[PDB]
Amino acid sequence: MNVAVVGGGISGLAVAHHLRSRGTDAVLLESSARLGGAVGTHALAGYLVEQGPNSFLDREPATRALAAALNLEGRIRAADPAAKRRYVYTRGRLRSVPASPPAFLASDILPLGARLRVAGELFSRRAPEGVDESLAAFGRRHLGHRATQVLLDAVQTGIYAGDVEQLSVAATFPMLVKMEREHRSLILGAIRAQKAQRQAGTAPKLSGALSTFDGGLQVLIDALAASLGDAAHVGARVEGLAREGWRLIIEEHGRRAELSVAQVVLAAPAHATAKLLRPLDDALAALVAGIAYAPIAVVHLGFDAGTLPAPDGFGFLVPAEEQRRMLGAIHASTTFPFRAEGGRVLYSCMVGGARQPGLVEQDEDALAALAREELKALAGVTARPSFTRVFRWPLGIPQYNLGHLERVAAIDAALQRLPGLHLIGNAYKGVGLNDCIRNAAQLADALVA
Numbered sequence: 001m002n003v004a005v006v007g008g009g010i011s012g013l014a015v016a017h018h019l020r021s022r023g024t025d026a027v028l029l030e031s032s033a034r035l036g037g038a039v040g041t042h043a044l045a046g047y048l049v050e051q052g053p054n055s056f057l058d059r060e061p062a063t064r065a066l067a068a069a070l071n072l073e074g075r076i077r078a079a080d081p082a083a084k085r086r087y088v089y090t091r092g093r094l095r096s097v098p099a100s101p102p103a104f105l106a107s108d109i110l111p112l113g114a115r116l117r118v119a120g121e122l123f124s125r126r127a128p129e130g131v132d133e134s135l136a137a138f139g140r141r142h143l144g145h146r147a148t149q150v151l152l153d154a155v156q157t158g159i160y161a162g163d164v165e166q167l168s169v170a171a172t173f174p175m176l177v178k179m180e181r182e183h184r185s186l187i188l189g190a191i192r193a194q195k196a197q198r199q200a201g202t203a204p205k206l207s208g209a210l211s212t213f214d215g216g217l218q219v220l221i222d223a224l225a226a227s228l229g230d231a232a233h234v235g236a237r238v239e240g241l242a243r244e245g246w247r248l249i250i251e252e253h254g255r256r257a258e259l260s261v262a263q264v265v266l267a268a269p270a271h272a273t274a275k276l277l278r279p280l281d282d283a284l285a286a287l288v289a290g291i292a293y294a295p296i297a298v299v300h301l302g303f304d305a306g307t308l309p310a311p312d313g314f315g316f317l318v319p320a321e322e323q324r325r326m327l328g329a330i331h332a333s334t335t336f337p338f339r340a341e342g343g344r345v346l347y348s349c350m351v352g353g354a355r356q357p358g359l360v361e362q363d364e365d366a367l368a369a370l371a372r373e374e375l376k377a378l379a380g381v382t383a384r385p386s387f388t389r390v391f392r393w394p395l396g397i398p399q400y401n402l403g404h405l406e407r408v409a410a411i412d413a414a415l416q417r418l419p420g421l422h423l424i425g426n427a428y429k430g431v432g433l434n435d436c437i438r439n440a441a442q443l444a445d446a447l448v449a
Protein backbone atom coordinates (compact mmCIF):
# COMPACT_ATOMS: atom_id res chain seq x y z
CA MET A 1 0.00 0.00 0.00
CA ASN A 2 2.70 2.51 1.03
CA VAL A 3 5.61 4.06 -0.89
CA ALA A 4 8.63 5.93 0.44
CA VAL A 5 10.18 8.51 -1.85
CA VAL A 6 13.79 9.43 -1.12
CA GLY A 7 14.83 12.93 -2.21
CA GLY A 8 12.76 16.09 -2.57
CA GLY A 9 13.89 17.75 -5.78
CA ILE A 10 11.43 18.07 -8.69
CA SER A 11 11.57 14.31 -9.43
CA GLY A 12 10.82 13.16 -5.89
CA LEU A 13 8.15 15.82 -5.35
CA ALA A 14 6.42 14.99 -8.66
CA VAL A 15 6.47 11.23 -7.98
CA ALA A 16 4.98 11.63 -4.47
CA HIS A 17 2.37 14.10 -5.73
CA HIS A 18 1.26 11.87 -8.65
CA LEU A 19 0.99 8.86 -6.32
CA ARG A 20 -1.11 10.78 -3.78
CA SER A 21 -3.36 12.33 -6.48
CA ARG A 22 -4.24 8.76 -7.54
CA GLY A 23 -4.86 7.48 -3.99
CA THR A 24 -1.51 5.91 -3.11
CA ASP A 25 -0.12 7.19 0.17
CA ALA A 26 3.49 8.27 -0.24
CA VAL A 27 5.96 9.61 2.31
CA LEU A 28 8.82 11.75 0.99
CA LEU A 29 12.13 12.25 2.81
CA GLU A 30 14.40 15.20 2.05
CA SER A 31 17.79 15.52 3.77
CA SER A 32 17.98 19.33 3.36
CA ALA A 33 16.07 21.88 5.47
CA ARG A 34 14.04 22.85 2.35
CA LEU A 35 12.30 21.13 -0.58
CA GLY A 36 13.09 21.81 -4.25
CA GLY A 37 16.55 20.30 -4.76
CA ALA A 38 18.24 22.27 -7.57
CA VAL A 39 15.13 24.50 -7.95
CA GLY A 40 14.99 27.60 -5.74
CA THR A 41 14.07 31.26 -6.25
CA HIS A 42 15.31 33.93 -3.82
CA ALA A 43 13.82 37.39 -3.31
CA LEU A 44 16.88 39.60 -2.71
CA ALA A 45 17.59 43.31 -3.32
CA GLY A 46 14.53 43.81 -5.58
CA TYR A 47 15.23 40.73 -7.70
CA LEU A 48 13.92 37.21 -8.01
CA VAL A 49 17.19 35.24 -8.43
CA GLU A 50 17.25 31.57 -9.48
CA GLN A 51 19.44 29.06 -7.58
CA GLY A 52 19.87 26.85 -10.61
CA PRO A 53 17.20 26.36 -13.31
CA ASN A 54 15.63 29.47 -14.87
CA SER A 55 12.91 28.13 -17.17
CA PHE A 56 11.22 25.28 -19.00
CA LEU A 57 10.07 25.02 -22.62
CA ASP A 58 6.28 25.11 -22.61
CA ARG A 59 6.05 22.04 -24.86
CA GLU A 60 5.61 19.14 -22.37
CA PRO A 61 2.03 17.89 -21.64
CA ALA A 62 3.11 16.43 -18.24
CA THR A 63 4.28 19.86 -17.01
CA ARG A 64 0.95 21.38 -18.08
CA ALA A 65 -1.01 18.53 -16.46
CA LEU A 66 0.96 19.14 -13.25
CA ALA A 67 0.44 22.92 -13.33
CA ALA A 68 -3.31 22.23 -13.90
CA ALA A 69 -3.47 19.74 -11.00
CA LEU A 70 -1.82 22.40 -8.81
CA ASN A 71 -3.91 25.36 -10.07
CA LEU A 72 -0.79 27.00 -11.53
CA GLU A 73 -1.71 27.53 -15.22
CA GLY A 74 -2.58 31.22 -14.72
CA ARG A 75 0.76 31.82 -13.00
CA ILE A 76 2.82 30.55 -16.00
CA ARG A 77 4.78 33.40 -17.61
CA ALA A 78 6.18 33.60 -21.13
CA ALA A 79 9.57 34.73 -22.44
CA ASP A 80 9.66 38.57 -22.31
CA PRO A 81 8.76 41.41 -24.66
CA ALA A 82 11.68 41.41 -27.29
CA ALA A 83 14.26 38.88 -26.19
CA LYS A 84 13.82 36.24 -28.90
CA ARG A 85 17.44 36.49 -30.06
CA ARG A 86 20.21 34.17 -28.85
CA TYR A 87 23.88 35.15 -29.13
CA VAL A 88 27.09 33.16 -29.48
CA TYR A 89 30.54 34.64 -28.87
CA THR A 90 32.56 33.64 -31.93
CA ARG A 91 35.23 35.35 -34.04
CA GLY A 92 35.72 38.39 -31.79
CA ARG A 93 32.14 39.41 -30.93
CA LEU A 94 28.69 38.36 -29.76
CA ARG A 95 26.86 37.14 -32.85
CA SER A 96 23.11 36.70 -33.35
CA VAL A 97 21.94 33.08 -33.81
CA PRO A 98 19.73 32.97 -36.95
CA ALA A 99 16.24 31.57 -36.30
CA SER A 100 15.19 30.67 -39.87
CA PRO A 101 17.01 28.88 -42.74
CA PRO A 102 16.94 32.00 -45.00
CA ALA A 103 18.30 34.22 -42.16
CA PHE A 104 21.03 31.58 -41.57
CA LEU A 105 22.31 31.55 -45.17
CA ALA A 106 22.67 35.36 -45.10
CA SER A 107 24.26 35.42 -41.61
CA ASP A 108 27.84 36.10 -40.42
CA ILE A 109 27.50 33.51 -37.61
CA LEU A 110 29.72 31.18 -39.71
CA PRO A 111 31.96 31.66 -42.79
CA LEU A 112 30.38 31.14 -46.24
CA GLY A 113 31.72 27.64 -47.06
CA ALA A 114 30.68 26.47 -43.58
CA ARG A 115 27.11 27.78 -44.11
CA LEU A 116 27.03 26.02 -47.47
CA ARG A 117 28.18 22.84 -45.65
CA VAL A 118 25.15 23.06 -43.30
CA ALA A 119 22.94 23.00 -46.44
CA GLY A 120 24.94 19.92 -47.50
CA GLU A 121 23.41 18.10 -44.48
CA LEU A 122 21.03 16.77 -47.17
CA PHE A 123 23.95 14.58 -48.24
CA SER A 124 24.91 13.30 -44.76
CA ARG A 125 26.54 9.90 -44.75
CA ARG A 126 25.04 6.97 -42.82
CA ALA A 127 25.49 6.89 -39.03
CA PRO A 128 28.24 4.52 -37.84
CA GLU A 129 26.53 1.12 -37.40
CA GLY A 130 26.09 -0.04 -33.81
CA VAL A 131 28.16 2.82 -32.44
CA ASP A 132 27.17 5.09 -29.57
CA GLU A 133 28.53 8.08 -31.41
CA SER A 134 29.46 11.36 -29.73
CA LEU A 135 27.64 14.65 -30.22
CA ALA A 136 30.74 16.13 -31.88
CA ALA A 137 31.09 13.13 -34.25
CA PHE A 138 27.38 13.39 -35.05
CA GLY A 139 27.84 17.08 -35.83
CA ARG A 140 30.92 16.71 -38.02
CA ARG A 141 29.05 14.12 -40.09
CA HIS A 142 25.80 16.13 -40.44
CA LEU A 143 26.84 19.80 -40.03
CA GLY A 144 30.54 20.30 -40.74
CA HIS A 145 33.33 21.25 -38.31
CA ARG A 146 32.48 24.96 -37.96
CA ALA A 147 28.77 24.44 -37.14
CA THR A 148 29.66 21.72 -34.62
CA GLN A 149 32.48 23.69 -33.01
CA VAL A 150 30.52 26.88 -32.45
CA LEU A 151 26.82 26.11 -32.73
CA LEU A 152 26.20 22.54 -31.58
CA ASP A 153 28.82 23.12 -28.90
CA ALA A 154 26.84 26.20 -27.75
CA VAL A 155 23.50 24.30 -27.61
CA GLN A 156 25.24 21.55 -25.59
CA THR A 157 26.76 24.11 -23.18
CA GLY A 158 23.41 25.80 -22.49
CA ILE A 159 21.80 22.45 -21.52
CA TYR A 160 24.48 20.15 -20.04
CA ALA A 161 27.58 22.30 -19.39
CA GLY A 162 29.36 19.30 -20.89
CA ASP A 163 32.03 18.23 -23.33
CA VAL A 164 30.84 17.88 -26.93
CA GLU A 165 33.46 15.12 -27.58
CA GLN A 166 32.18 12.98 -24.69
CA LEU A 167 28.39 13.35 -24.86
CA SER A 168 26.30 10.58 -26.39
CA VAL A 169 24.06 12.13 -29.07
CA ALA A 170 21.59 9.19 -28.58
CA ALA A 171 21.26 9.88 -24.81
CA THR A 172 21.34 13.72 -25.03
CA PHE A 173 19.21 14.21 -28.19
CA PRO A 174 16.98 11.10 -28.68
CA MET A 175 14.84 12.84 -31.32
CA LEU A 176 17.80 13.75 -33.56
CA VAL A 177 18.89 10.09 -33.61
CA LYS A 178 15.34 8.89 -34.35
CA MET A 179 14.97 11.32 -37.28
CA GLU A 180 18.39 10.18 -38.50
CA ARG A 181 17.27 6.53 -38.27
CA GLU A 182 14.08 7.24 -40.23
CA HIS A 183 15.42 9.85 -42.70
CA ARG A 184 19.27 9.90 -42.70
CA SER A 185 19.21 13.68 -43.29
CA LEU A 186 17.72 16.03 -40.65
CA ILE A 187 16.72 18.56 -43.35
CA LEU A 188 14.96 15.73 -45.24
CA GLY A 189 13.16 14.58 -42.09
CA ALA A 190 11.91 18.13 -41.51
CA ILE A 191 10.67 18.64 -45.10
CA ARG A 192 8.84 15.30 -44.83
CA ALA A 193 7.45 16.04 -41.34
CA GLN A 194 6.05 19.35 -42.59
CA LYS A 195 4.43 17.47 -45.51
CA ALA A 196 2.86 14.99 -43.06
CA GLN A 197 1.30 17.51 -40.63
CA ARG A 198 0.04 19.64 -43.56
CA GLN A 199 -2.21 16.64 -44.41
CA ALA A 200 -5.10 16.63 -41.86
CA GLY A 201 -7.76 19.78 -31.54
CA THR A 202 -9.62 19.73 -28.20
CA ALA A 203 -6.98 20.99 -25.75
CA PRO A 204 -5.09 24.27 -26.40
CA LYS A 205 -1.90 24.08 -28.48
CA LEU A 206 1.40 24.29 -26.54
CA SER A 207 3.52 27.25 -27.66
CA GLY A 208 6.95 25.80 -26.86
CA ALA A 209 7.80 29.24 -25.43
CA LEU A 210 10.58 29.70 -22.86
CA SER A 211 8.58 29.88 -19.61
CA THR A 212 8.60 30.28 -15.81
CA PHE A 213 6.11 31.32 -13.08
CA ASP A 214 5.16 34.76 -11.72
CA GLY A 215 7.37 34.29 -8.62
CA GLY A 216 10.03 32.10 -10.24
CA LEU A 217 10.15 28.32 -10.38
CA GLN A 218 9.77 28.47 -6.57
CA VAL A 219 6.02 28.83 -7.24
CA LEU A 220 6.01 25.23 -8.52
CA ILE A 221 8.00 24.10 -5.46
CA ASP A 222 5.92 25.96 -2.82
CA ALA A 223 2.83 24.41 -4.45
CA LEU A 224 4.14 20.82 -4.32
CA ALA A 225 5.23 21.39 -0.70
CA ALA A 226 1.75 22.69 0.22
CA SER A 227 0.03 19.86 -1.69
CA LEU A 228 2.01 17.12 0.09
CA GLY A 229 2.09 18.91 3.47
CA ASP A 230 2.78 16.34 6.21
CA ALA A 231 3.59 13.49 3.82
CA ALA A 232 6.90 15.21 2.97
CA HIS A 233 9.60 15.39 5.65
CA VAL A 234 12.40 17.93 5.65
CA GLY A 235 15.78 17.28 7.32
CA ALA A 236 15.18 13.53 7.04
CA ARG A 237 18.37 11.89 5.71
CA VAL A 238 17.94 8.26 4.66
CA GLU A 239 21.14 6.40 5.56
CA GLY A 240 20.08 2.80 4.97
CA LEU A 241 17.67 0.44 3.27
CA ALA A 242 17.24 -3.35 3.21
CA ARG A 243 14.71 -6.12 2.43
CA GLU A 244 12.13 -7.57 4.89
CA GLY A 245 9.20 -5.32 1.72
CA TRP A 246 11.68 -2.47 2.54
CA ARG A 247 12.96 -0.90 5.71
CA LEU A 248 14.50 2.60 5.79
CA ILE A 249 16.83 3.92 8.47
CA ILE A 250 16.17 7.64 8.76
CA GLU A 251 18.04 10.37 10.61
CA GLU A 252 15.53 13.07 11.57
CA HIS A 253 15.99 15.55 14.47
CA GLY A 254 19.52 14.23 15.17
CA ARG A 255 18.15 10.76 16.05
CA ARG A 256 17.57 7.37 14.37
CA ALA A 257 14.13 6.20 13.24
CA GLU A 258 12.82 3.34 11.09
CA LEU A 259 10.10 3.06 8.44
CA SER A 260 8.55 0.07 6.67
CA VAL A 261 6.99 0.41 3.22
CA ALA A 262 5.93 -1.86 0.34
CA GLN A 263 8.01 0.03 -2.25
CA VAL A 264 10.90 2.50 -2.41
CA VAL A 265 11.52 5.22 -4.98
CA LEU A 266 15.04 6.65 -4.92
CA ALA A 267 15.05 10.16 -6.37
CA ALA A 268 18.42 11.26 -4.99
CA PRO A 269 21.47 12.07 -7.21
CA ALA A 270 23.61 9.18 -8.52
CA HIS A 271 26.33 9.45 -5.81
CA ALA A 272 23.79 9.40 -2.93
CA THR A 273 21.57 6.65 -4.44
CA ALA A 274 24.69 4.53 -5.05
CA LYS A 275 25.63 4.78 -1.36
CA LEU A 276 22.18 3.35 -0.43
CA LEU A 277 22.24 0.62 -3.10
CA ARG A 278 25.74 -0.69 -2.15
CA PRO A 279 24.71 -3.22 0.58
CA LEU A 280 21.98 -4.66 -1.71
CA ASP A 281 23.98 -4.92 -4.95
CA ASP A 282 27.60 -3.74 -5.29
CA ALA A 283 27.61 -4.09 -9.10
CA LEU A 284 24.41 -2.01 -9.43
CA ALA A 285 25.69 0.72 -7.10
CA ALA A 286 28.94 0.86 -9.15
CA LEU A 287 26.95 1.40 -12.37
CA VAL A 288 24.95 4.16 -10.68
CA ALA A 289 28.13 5.59 -9.03
CA GLY A 290 29.77 5.75 -12.48
CA ILE A 291 27.42 8.50 -13.72
CA ALA A 292 29.57 11.62 -14.02
CA TYR A 293 28.37 15.05 -12.95
CA ALA A 294 29.81 18.39 -14.10
CA PRO A 295 30.27 21.16 -11.47
CA ILE A 296 28.65 24.52 -12.17
CA ALA A 297 28.50 27.93 -10.51
CA VAL A 298 25.97 30.71 -11.18
CA VAL A 299 27.19 34.28 -10.60
CA HIS A 300 24.30 36.76 -10.43
CA LEU A 301 25.16 40.42 -11.11
CA GLY A 302 22.58 43.14 -10.42
CA PHE A 303 22.89 46.69 -11.76
CA ASP A 304 21.12 49.94 -10.79
CA ALA A 305 18.67 51.21 -13.41
CA GLY A 306 20.52 53.54 -15.80
CA THR A 307 24.07 52.31 -15.03
CA LEU A 308 24.03 50.11 -18.15
CA PRO A 309 21.52 49.39 -20.94
CA ALA A 310 19.18 46.39 -20.91
CA PRO A 311 21.05 43.65 -22.84
CA ASP A 312 19.14 42.40 -25.90
CA GLY A 313 18.18 38.71 -26.19
CA PHE A 314 17.70 35.77 -23.81
CA GLY A 315 21.46 35.64 -23.19
CA PHE A 316 24.65 34.35 -24.80
CA LEU A 317 26.76 31.23 -25.02
CA VAL A 318 30.49 30.81 -25.58
CA PRO A 319 32.02 27.80 -27.41
CA ALA A 320 34.86 25.90 -25.71
CA GLU A 321 37.20 26.65 -28.63
CA GLU A 322 37.10 30.32 -27.61
CA GLN A 323 39.06 29.28 -24.48
CA ARG A 324 37.10 31.43 -22.05
CA ARG A 325 36.40 31.11 -18.31
CA MET A 326 32.65 31.71 -18.60
CA LEU A 327 30.06 29.45 -20.31
CA GLY A 328 27.46 32.17 -21.03
CA ALA A 329 24.79 34.36 -19.34
CA ILE A 330 21.02 35.10 -19.06
CA HIS A 331 19.71 38.28 -19.42
CA ALA A 332 17.27 37.26 -16.65
CA SER A 333 15.53 40.65 -16.43
CA THR A 334 15.19 41.07 -20.22
CA THR A 335 13.66 37.60 -20.54
CA PHE A 336 11.46 37.97 -17.44
CA PRO A 337 10.96 41.67 -16.54
CA PHE A 338 8.86 40.81 -13.44
CA ARG A 339 11.92 39.21 -11.78
CA ALA A 340 13.50 42.65 -11.32
CA GLU A 341 11.84 45.71 -9.78
CA GLY A 342 12.32 49.36 -10.74
CA GLY A 343 14.41 49.05 -13.93
CA ARG A 344 17.22 46.97 -12.36
CA VAL A 345 19.27 44.80 -14.74
CA LEU A 346 20.19 41.18 -13.82
CA TYR A 347 22.78 38.88 -15.46
CA SER A 348 23.02 35.22 -14.37
CA CYS A 349 26.46 34.03 -15.46
CA MET A 350 27.38 30.35 -15.70
CA VAL A 351 30.86 29.15 -14.81
CA GLY A 352 32.55 25.74 -14.81
CA GLY A 353 31.14 22.76 -16.70
CA ALA A 354 32.86 19.49 -17.69
CA ARG A 355 35.90 21.13 -19.34
CA GLN A 356 36.70 23.59 -16.49
CA PRO A 357 35.37 22.00 -13.24
CA GLY A 358 38.14 23.52 -11.05
CA LEU A 359 36.70 27.06 -11.38
CA VAL A 360 33.68 26.00 -9.27
CA GLU A 361 36.02 25.17 -6.35
CA GLN A 362 36.92 28.89 -6.13
CA ASP A 363 35.36 31.23 -3.54
CA GLU A 364 32.52 33.63 -4.32
CA ASP A 365 34.67 36.79 -4.51
CA ALA A 366 36.94 35.12 -7.09
CA LEU A 367 33.96 33.82 -9.11
CA ALA A 368 32.36 37.29 -9.12
CA ALA A 369 35.63 38.83 -10.35
CA LEU A 370 35.92 36.16 -13.07
CA ALA A 371 32.32 36.79 -14.21
CA ARG A 372 32.98 40.55 -14.30
CA GLU A 373 36.21 40.19 -16.32
CA GLU A 374 34.61 37.82 -18.82
CA LEU A 375 31.42 39.87 -19.14
CA LYS A 376 33.69 42.87 -19.89
CA ALA A 377 35.83 41.08 -22.51
CA LEU A 378 32.90 39.28 -24.24
CA ALA A 379 29.89 41.57 -23.71
CA GLY A 380 31.59 44.95 -23.17
CA VAL A 381 30.17 45.37 -19.64
CA THR A 382 32.27 47.93 -17.73
CA ALA A 383 29.76 49.08 -15.08
CA ARG A 384 30.04 48.13 -11.39
CA PRO A 385 27.26 45.86 -10.06
CA SER A 386 25.25 46.87 -6.97
CA PHE A 387 24.19 43.26 -6.32
CA THR A 388 26.16 40.00 -6.29
CA ARG A 389 24.99 36.50 -5.44
CA VAL A 390 26.91 33.28 -6.15
CA PHE A 391 25.53 29.72 -6.02
CA ARG A 392 27.94 26.76 -6.38
CA TRP A 393 26.76 23.33 -7.57
CA PRO A 394 29.71 20.91 -7.54
CA LEU A 395 27.55 18.05 -7.81
CA GLY A 396 26.78 19.68 -11.08
CA ILE A 397 24.78 18.44 -14.05
CA PRO A 398 24.62 14.77 -15.07
CA GLN A 399 26.81 13.93 -18.07
CA TYR A 400 25.23 11.50 -20.53
CA ASN A 401 28.59 10.50 -21.97
CA LEU A 402 29.50 7.60 -24.30
CA GLY A 403 28.10 4.33 -22.93
CA HIS A 404 25.33 6.06 -20.93
CA LEU A 405 22.37 4.23 -22.52
CA GLU A 406 23.98 0.79 -22.02
CA ARG A 407 24.71 1.78 -18.40
CA VAL A 408 21.07 2.77 -17.76
CA ALA A 409 19.92 -0.45 -19.49
CA ALA A 410 22.12 -2.48 -17.11
CA ILE A 411 20.87 -0.34 -14.17
CA ASP A 412 17.31 -1.28 -15.22
CA ALA A 413 18.10 -5.00 -15.54
CA ALA A 414 19.63 -5.08 -12.04
CA LEU A 415 16.52 -3.36 -10.60
CA GLN A 416 14.25 -6.20 -11.80
CA ARG A 417 16.09 -8.62 -9.49
CA LEU A 418 15.10 -6.28 -6.60
CA PRO A 419 11.26 -6.06 -6.33
CA GLY A 420 9.70 -2.80 -5.09
CA LEU A 421 12.81 -0.74 -5.79
CA HIS A 422 12.72 2.12 -8.33
CA LEU A 423 15.01 4.91 -9.54
CA ILE A 424 14.02 8.38 -10.74
CA GLY A 425 15.90 11.68 -11.12
CA ASN A 426 18.12 13.68 -13.51
CA ALA A 427 20.90 11.03 -13.58
CA TYR A 428 19.13 8.52 -15.86
CA LYS A 429 16.52 9.47 -18.48
CA GLY A 430 16.50 13.25 -18.84
CA VAL A 431 18.19 16.16 -17.09
CA GLY A 432 15.61 18.94 -17.58
CA LEU A 433 12.60 19.97 -15.48
CA ASN A 434 10.17 18.66 -18.20
CA ASP A 435 11.90 15.26 -18.47
CA CYS A 436 11.96 14.85 -14.68
CA ILE A 437 8.21 15.67 -14.41
CA ARG A 438 7.20 13.41 -17.34
CA ASN A 439 9.40 10.54 -16.05
CA ALA A 440 8.07 11.07 -12.53
CA ALA A 441 4.42 10.77 -13.64
CA GLN A 442 5.18 7.75 -15.82
CA LEU A 443 6.73 5.84 -12.87
CA ALA A 444 3.89 6.85 -10.51
CA ASP A 445 1.30 5.51 -13.02
CA ALA A 446 3.18 2.20 -13.41
CA LEU A 447 3.36 1.64 -9.60
CA VAL A 448 -0.45 1.48 -9.46
CA ALA A 449 -0.48 -1.95 -10.78
Ligand SMILES: Cc1cc2nc3c(=O)[nH]c(=O)nc-3n(C[C@H](O)[C@H](O)[C@H](O)COP(=O)(O)OP(=O)(O)OC[C@H]3O[C@@H](n4cnc5c(N)ncnc54)[C@H](O)[C@@H]3O)c2cc1C
Nearest residue numbers: 007009010011031037038052053054055238425426432433
Ligand atom coordinates in the same frame (compact mmCIF):
# COMPACT_ATOMS: atom_id res chain seq x y z
C1 LIG B 1 22.54 25.81 -12.53
C2 LIG B 1 21.72 24.82 -13.31
C3 LIG B 1 20.82 25.33 -14.25
C4 LIG B 1 19.76 24.55 -14.72
N1 LIG B 1 18.88 25.06 -15.64
C5 LIG B 1 17.82 24.30 -16.10
C6 LIG B 1 16.94 24.87 -17.00
O1 LIG B 1 16.79 26.09 -16.98
N2 LIG B 1 15.89 24.11 -17.47
C7 LIG B 1 15.71 22.81 -17.05
O2 LIG B 1 14.76 22.17 -17.49
N3 LIG B 1 16.58 22.24 -16.14
C8 LIG B 1 17.65 22.99 -15.65
N4 LIG B 1 18.55 22.46 -14.74
C9 LIG B 1 18.55 20.97 -14.48
C10 LIG B 1 17.45 20.62 -13.49
O3 LIG B 1 17.23 21.73 -12.64
C11 LIG B 1 17.80 19.39 -12.65
O4 LIG B 1 18.15 18.28 -13.45
C12 LIG B 1 16.64 18.96 -11.75
O5 LIG B 1 16.16 20.04 -10.97
C13 LIG B 1 17.12 17.86 -10.82
O6 LIG B 1 16.01 17.44 -10.07
P1 LIG B 1 16.05 16.04 -9.31
O7 LIG B 1 14.81 15.87 -8.47
O8 LIG B 1 16.12 14.92 -10.30
O9 LIG B 1 17.40 16.08 -8.40
P2 LIG B 1 17.77 17.12 -7.21
O10 LIG B 1 17.21 18.49 -7.45
O11 LIG B 1 19.27 17.24 -7.02
O12 LIG B 1 17.07 16.53 -5.89
C14 LIG B 1 17.56 15.38 -5.24
C15 LIG B 1 17.36 15.60 -3.75
O13 LIG B 1 17.61 14.42 -3.01
C16 LIG B 1 18.21 14.79 -1.79
N5 LIG B 1 18.95 13.68 -1.14
C17 LIG B 1 20.21 13.22 -1.42
N6 LIG B 1 20.50 12.20 -0.58
C18 LIG B 1 19.44 12.01 0.25
C19 LIG B 1 19.20 11.12 1.29
N7 LIG B 1 20.07 10.15 1.57
N8 LIG B 1 17.99 11.16 1.97
C20 LIG B 1 17.02 12.09 1.62
N9 LIG B 1 17.27 12.97 0.58
C21 LIG B 1 18.46 12.94 -0.09
C22 LIG B 1 19.06 16.00 -2.10
O14 LIG B 1 19.17 16.85 -0.99
C23 LIG B 1 18.28 16.69 -3.21
O15 LIG B 1 17.53 17.76 -2.70
C24 LIG B 1 19.59 23.24 -14.27
C25 LIG B 1 20.50 22.74 -13.33
C26 LIG B 1 21.55 23.52 -12.84
C27 LIG B 1 22.02 23.14 -11.47
Ligand SMILES: O=C(O)c1cc(Oc2ccc(C(F)(F)F)cc2Cl)ccc1[N+](=O)[O-]
Nearest residue numbers: 157158159160161315316327328329330350
Ligand atom coordinates in the same frame (compact mmCIF):
# COMPACT_ATOMS: atom_id res chain seq x y z
O1 LIG C 1 19.23 27.96 -22.59
C1 LIG C 1 20.37 28.15 -23.09
O2 LIG C 1 20.78 27.50 -24.08
C2 LIG C 1 21.27 29.19 -22.47
C3 LIG C 1 21.77 28.93 -21.21
C4 LIG C 1 22.61 29.83 -20.56
O3 LIG C 1 23.08 29.52 -19.31
C5 LIG C 1 23.01 28.24 -18.81
C6 LIG C 1 21.87 27.75 -18.16
C7 LIG C 1 21.88 26.44 -17.67
C8 LIG C 1 22.99 25.60 -17.82
C9 LIG C 1 22.94 24.20 -17.29
F1 LIG C 1 21.70 23.73 -17.38
F2 LIG C 1 23.75 23.43 -17.99
F3 LIG C 1 23.33 24.17 -16.04
C10 LIG C 1 24.15 26.05 -18.47
C11 LIG C 1 24.19 27.35 -18.97
CL1 LIG C 1 25.63 28.00 -19.81
C12 LIG C 1 22.98 31.03 -21.17
C13 LIG C 1 22.50 31.36 -22.44
C14 LIG C 1 21.65 30.48 -23.13
N1 LIG C 1 21.21 30.83 -24.37
O4 LIG C 1 20.37 30.00 -25.11
O5 LIG C 1 21.62 32.05 -24.92
